[PDB]
Structure 1
Amino acid sequence: DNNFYSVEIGDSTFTVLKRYQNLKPIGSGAQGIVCAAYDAILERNVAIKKLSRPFQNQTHAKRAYRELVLMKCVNHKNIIGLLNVFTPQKSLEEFQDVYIVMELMDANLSQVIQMELDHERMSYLLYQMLCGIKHLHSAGIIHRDLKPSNIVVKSDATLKILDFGLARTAGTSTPYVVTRYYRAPEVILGMGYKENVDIWSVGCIMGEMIKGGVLFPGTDHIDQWNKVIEQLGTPSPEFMKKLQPTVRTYVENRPKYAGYSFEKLFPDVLFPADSEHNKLKASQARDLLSKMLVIDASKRISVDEALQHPYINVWYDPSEAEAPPPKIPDKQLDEREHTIEEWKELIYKEVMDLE
């Protein structure tokens, strides 16, 4: 009879529009579990993220809201497409679960890291990552959790970014929610952050692509810092000074390191043959790596500069790189506390609006 229907995927219940068929488990976001599904109406694959009673909690609801809002107003060939949203429940009283339907790409960057890209591929993917991010930043939003498994690709070589649960405007204001290996120093050492925090992640991702493996492995949150300084060498005192005093002592106590040069961090053996024409050169790649992977945020290149960098700008196209920002309904400000119930209503209105 009715509009929705239910499938058990292992221990989890997906109740969804009958259009959505053949769910298969595929993943998780910061919040949420995700299935792939056939949309019998549009006749294509999709991805359905279930968020379970997101209002359960300050955290869960904050993130859920953001992700709802951002998924809506964002508009770029390099961000993942919204397709649908719903809830099977029929009233604010009933209300408990949310579902978000998205384009399904083919794979995440996992996946690419082990294969051997030519420069044109490597550079092109980065170029796309950056356009994506310049889109978000252009409206003042920071992804915060860029990382291979949040970047997806398709076999025609296109690429999009994913998961906005952690996305928000500039920092200060909890630590351990960004994935360990991609934590910028500002994030590791608790100093709060600006948009180029995302740049650090891009650098790690790029490094991983070339390296074949995680750039700064890091066996726990504190060891993370060792891996960074072991490779890049010890930050300057100018930098130390910005640390809070408790963290400053630990840091200044670390064994000093010269660090390797990018030439030694990333030697030619690692790269493919250099390009037919000019700028797609290992050394140019090194040069970009060296302006992204920089401990001191205030000395770190921005996306705009990264788009202008010779290794990247060979694809530069203003209609991709300089598109209008997403418009965020100025209500949503990614910070304010609310209540058990205030949230419950916010999300619901928000799903309602969006249904």
Structure 2
Amino acid sequence: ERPTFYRQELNKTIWEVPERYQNLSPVGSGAYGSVCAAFDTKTGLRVAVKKLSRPFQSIIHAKRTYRELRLLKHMKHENVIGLLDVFTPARSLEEFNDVYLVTHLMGADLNNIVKCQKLTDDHVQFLIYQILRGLKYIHSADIIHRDLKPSNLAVNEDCELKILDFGLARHTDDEMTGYVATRWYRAPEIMLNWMHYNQTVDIWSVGCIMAELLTGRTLFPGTDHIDQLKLILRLVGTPGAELLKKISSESARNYIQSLTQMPKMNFANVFIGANPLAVDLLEKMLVLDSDKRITAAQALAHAYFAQYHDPDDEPVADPYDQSFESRDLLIDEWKSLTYDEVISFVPPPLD
């Protein structure tokens, strides 16, 4: 019942994978990590196979490995990247070193489809509907994406969409400095560490994506953190007395107060000629105070999506046990937990 594995070198690594996966070919030019498109002969799908780099290099990497595998195993929703397969060539814990993860190969990201382009109003509707449908599922598991942006949205030829890279630490270290897209979708409370934030950060990111799909333009392309914040307050107004109380960082509060106050702008004059229902939705997403943003479950019931909305086809998730997050473990302990999670994996049904 353990498959037969075969070896090859791909992008200077030895990849050892079950024979069911044929014709492995690097994709994304390193942008997604060590990932190969392959043909899965068992399901007949084109799949993306990721070989984790340095999975057990430090306590921090070990845990990051475990976390990503936990997150992927839990997700079973059409608009969320999940696991078709997870394997290692190792036959015991003692020889366990590498982890390979397998999911559907969508083929492109939103970003590398829609660069510089206003999309038709039904393409916007359909794409945002799907982001919000996947997001309602993710949030119902108490998972926060934290890094939603076009590059993290994997889209296929039929404009079907799956959300990538949710709930990871990873986005931390790579650069958020200067004129960089890694920062343009971030909610201001997380960009400037205003407070203990939560899942509402992601609705901000949805707003920013939706605007950009409408206009063809990045909504807040700041040259840095401070220039971006000025872009943001110009549109959505400076914080009022109520939000200021909630900015638990005295440092941030004190800098915000130094800015000339500005009223919210009129979204109908900003998004000239766009569906009024779209405007109204963006107004509900791009609210400076996170507590007041629309939720994904609520946005799905908004009239903009009336063509796609179906409350019996917008599932929620099983509860996700993230107690491990507060556990203080050694490398070998995270590695063994990870091993158990590999070994116990159950394939989805092939129809």
Fold match, TM over 0.5? yes
CA distance in structure 2 between the partners assigned to 1:145 and 1:25 by the alignment: 24
Select which of 220, 240, 245 maps to 2:244: 240
1:28 to 1:51, Cα distance in 2 relative to 1, 3 A: farther
Indicate if the aligned counterparts of 2:119 and 2:216 stay in contact, CA closer than 8 A. Answer: no
Structure 2 equivalent of residue 171 of structure 1: none
Q: Please state how far the C-alpha of 1:233 moved relative to its aligned partner.
A: 2.6
3-state secondary structure, aligned to 2:42: coil
Partner of 1:88: 89
Match of 1:203 among 191, 203, 207: 207
Structure-2 change in CA distance of 1:332 and 1:320 (3 Å): farther
Aligned equivalent of 1:275: none
1:264-303 → structure 2 map (5 Å cutoff): 264-268=269-273, 271=274, 282-303=275-296
Distance 1:11 1:232, change over 3 A: farther
Map Cα deviations across residues 197-242 of structure 1 (whole Å, 9 max, x no partner): 1111111111121131322112233433233223323121322222
Q: Deviations over 1:4-39 (max 9, x none)?
A: 333333344433223223222223999843221122
Q: Which moved more, 1:284-293 or 1:217-226?
A: 217-226
* Gap change, CA 1:31 and 1:241, over 3 Å in 2: farther
Q: Is residue 120 of structure 2 the alignment partner of residue 118 of structure 1? A: yes
Equivalent-residue separation in structure 2 for 1:49 and 1:36 (angstroms): 9
Question: Partners in 2 of 1:94 and 1:220 — Cα distance?
Answer: 46
State the alpha-carbon separation in 2 of the partners of residues 62 and 41 from structure 1: 31
Specify the alignment match of 2:166 in structure 1. 164
Of 247, 251, 254 in structure 2, the residue corresponding to residue 249 of structure 1 is: 254
Deviates more, 1:58-67 or 1:69-78: 58-67
Distance 1:337 1:27 in 2: 35
Relative to the length of structure 2, the TM-score reads 0.85
Q: Is the 8 A contact 1:38 1:44 kept in 2?
A: yes
CA contact 1:74–1:327 (8 Å) conserved in 2? no
Give aligned pairs, total: 334
Aligned-residue offset at 1:56 = 2.0
Q: Which amino acid aligns with 1:303?
A: A
User: Any idea what SS the aligned residue of 2:78 has?
Assistant: coil
Q: Specify whether residues 292 and 94 from structure 1 end up closer, same or farther in structure 2 by C-alpha distance, changes over 3 A only.
A: same
Query: What is the rounded CA distance, in whole Å, between the counterparts of 1:312 and 1:260 in structure 2?
Result: 25
* Partner residue in 2 for 1:19: 20
The answer as to whether partners of 2:117 and 2:215 remain within 8 angstroms in 1 is no
Which amino acid is the alignment partner of residue 92 of structure 2? S
Taking the aligned partners of 1:303 and 1:29, their CA distance within structure 2 comes to 32
Unaligned stretches of 5+ in structure 2? 177-181, 347-351
Superposition map of 1:165-180 within 5 A: 165-166=167-168, 179-180=182-183
Q: Distance in 2 between matches of 1:102 and 1:150?
A: 15
1:214 lines up with 2:218 in the alignment: yes
Aligned partners of 1:75 and 1:326 also within 8 Å: no
* Alignment map for 1:111-150 (pairs within 5 Å): 111-150=113-152
Segment of structure 1 superposing worse, 127-136 or 32-41: 32-41
| Counterpart contact for 1:58–1:337, Cα < 8 Å | no
Q: Contact 1:27–1:34 (CA<8 Å) still a contact in 2?
A: yes
Match of 1:353 in 2: 344
Does structure 2 conserve the Cα–Cα contact (< 8 Å) formed by 1:184 and 1:201?
yes
The aligned amino acid for 1:325 is A
In 2, Cα distance between equivalents of 1:7 and 1:72? 27
The AA in structure 2 aligned to 1:326 is: D
Residues 24 and 213 of structure 1: CA distance in aligned 2, closer, same or farther (over 3 Å) = farther
> Match of 2:52?
51
Q: 1:350 to 1:81 in 2, by over 3 A?
A: closer
Q: 1:106, 1:154 within 8 Å by CA — same for their partners in 2?
A: yes
2:317 pairs, out of 325, 329, 334, with 325
The answer for unaligned runs of 5 or more in structure 1 is 168-173, 272-281
Q: Is the 8 A contact 1:31 1:64 kept in 2?
A: no
Taking only the aligned residue pairs, the percentage that are identical comes to 49
1 CA distance for matches of 2:31 and 2:168?
A: 7
Cα deviation, 1:14-68, whole Å, max 9, x if unaligned, reads 3322322322222399984322112233333110112123222333233322221
User: What is the distance in 2 between the residues matched to 1:28 and 1:135?
Assistant: 30
Q: Which moved more, 1:248-257 or 1:94-103?
A: 248-257
Distance 2:331 2:90 in 1: 18
